[PDB]
Write a protein that binds this ligand. Structure first.
Ligand SMILES: Cc1ccc(S[C@@H]2O[C@H](CO)[C@H](O)[C@H](n3cc(-c4c(F)c(F)c(N)c(F)c4F)nn3)[C@H]2O)cc1
Length: 138
């Protein structure tokens, strides 16, 4: 198992047609997962499944610039289940990050940080056992 939090360098940043695949298992009684695509200290794309926000499960997405969070984008479709193995695929497209979970499209997140070649880290954090984190070009 990989250490969590996990730092996956993305050399030279991201580019359209780059596919990032995260395989893991959600812990029992999970509270949160986070993927953080970072441009230095900024978070270009934060993808944050919350298992218990006011007793509801929701995905919160946002960007952090100069240490300030922006407007949240929320997805109530929630494909993660405590205790179960998952696959997150993040496909970089020209205008957005496209996220599929367990081979089913979940959401798109329009690029707010525009210097894709500077988004050169993926952090993976939260209540998972992490099996693999990798990328490839499609
Ligand atoms: C005024 C105001 C009031 C409340 C908020 S809440 C804020 O909302 C953001 C999305 O808009 C992010 O979710 C933030 N956030 C979550 C994590 C985090 C973490 F630190 C971890 F260690 C793990 N393991 C994890 F899964 C995480 F998600 N870090 N920063 C959250 O603090 C904002 C503004």
């Amino acid at each position: 198992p990989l250490i969590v939090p996990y730092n996956l360098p993305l050399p030279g940043g991201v580019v359209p047609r780059m596919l990032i695949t995260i395989l893991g298992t959600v812990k029992p009684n999970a509270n949160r997962i986070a993927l953080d695509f970072q441009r230095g200290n900024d978070v270009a794309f934060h993808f944050n499944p919350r298992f218990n926000e006011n007793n509801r499960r929701v995905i919160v997405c946002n960007t952090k610039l100069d240490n300030n969070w922006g407007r949240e984008e929320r997805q109530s479709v929630f494909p993660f289940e405590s205790g179960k193995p998952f696959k997150i695929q993040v496909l970089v497209e020209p205008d957005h990050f496209k996220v599929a979970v367990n081979d089913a499209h979940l959401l798109q997140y329009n690029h707010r940080v525009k210097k894709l070649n500077e988004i050169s880290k993926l952090g993976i954090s939260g209540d998972i056992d992490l099996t693999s984190a990798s990328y490839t070009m499609i």
